[model samples]
Target: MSSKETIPMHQRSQNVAELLTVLMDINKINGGDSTTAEKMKVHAKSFEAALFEKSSSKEEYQKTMKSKIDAMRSTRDKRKRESVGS
Candidate 1:
């Protein structure tokens, strides 16, 4: 018998990690231009919609992507500060 609670937790964590990796990879490829990034997000949602029939999946993907971009920006800021100090 499968533990009901275990499945939800595992699903959430796996989804989070996958989305985070996707955003980080995209940012790494496109370092500048907010315009381009926004366009990429639009395209991503469209692609997800085509591939995934669930509407919630697109929303979750968007949320995860937004958070990852913010995290990436924070990391960039920290690196800049450390470099200045050096």
Candidate 2:
């Protein structure tokens, strides 16, 4: 999923509140039973999956994190080399 589509828990909580609000508004407008409960249930499952799913292989995750650390070390070494060169 794109970064924009990845809703963090904190942001999702805010949206869940707003979704219920709109659902209630629609129910009131139509004089019908609100589907807020069912909708929330479905969303809850989706949110759980999004929040907990193993999106990356363990090897990929470790490699990415290690690469970040190695990049930092490389940058630091390059800075020292530049200082010596000057």
Candidate 3:
């Protein structure tokens, strides 16, 4: 997701971590063998689009990313558990 333009050092780190966490969780849920990785790439890219905001520092970006990720993970875990409920 790099471009020619450079961002503030702080913003860069937050973006990296946010995106990494999302990817990690997705991969973990998919058991490291996602045949539909491409399908989810769009969601990830959309996540990036919504994640970035014009900010002087990375703090806000980090918060947004973590919040979004936690919500998603919670929902996904719930669905997975409910699917096997008796």
Candidate 4:
């Protein structure tokens, strides 16, 4: 079987809330700039769906989180680099 699960529902819900908050912030940022509104909506919807219909198993969840975190880290770093360049 896959690795045993131990996280409580309440704890999971808390993390879900945090994920939603991040998505909302992204939504706000997208709203601030209408030039790429259409493209941003696609990414905004995708993130919301991922959080609501998250992975079932703990192993899968961890894997998904790792990728998401890595992607966010890359984006953050890229933005910082761009700002510095500017």
lDDT of each model, Cα atoms only?
A: 0.52, 0.48, 0.60, 0.55
lDDT of candidate 3 over 3-67, digit per residue (tens)? 32455656555655565566666666556555555545666666666556443345565567677
lDDT of 4 at 39: 48
Work out the TM-score per prediction: 0.35, 0.33, 0.53, 0.45
Please write out the lDDT profile of model 4 over residues 1-86, one tens digit for every residue.
Answer: 34334666565555445544444455454355554545455664576457547656776665675567567646655665665652
Count clashes in each candidate, considering only residues at least 3 apart in sequence or on different chains.
Answer: 0, 0, 0, 0
TM-score of 2: 0.33
The residue-by-residue lDDT of candidate 2 on 1-86, one tens digit each, is: 35434546674455444444544443444355546556645654464355345435434433543454455445545655665642
- The true-versus-predicted C-alpha distance at residue 78 of model 2, in Å, is 0.5
Candidate 2 Cα errors over 4 Å, as ranges? 1-55
Stretches of candidate 1 off by over 4 Å are: 1-56
Show where candidate 3 strays beyond 4 Å.
1-35, 53-57
TM-score computed on alpha carbons, candidate 3: 0.53
Of 2 and 4, the candidate ranking higher by TM-score: 4
Pairs of colliding residues, candidate 1? none
Cα lDDT tens digits, model 1, 24-71, are 455555464767666656654554444344324544545655565577
Highest lDDT scorer: 3
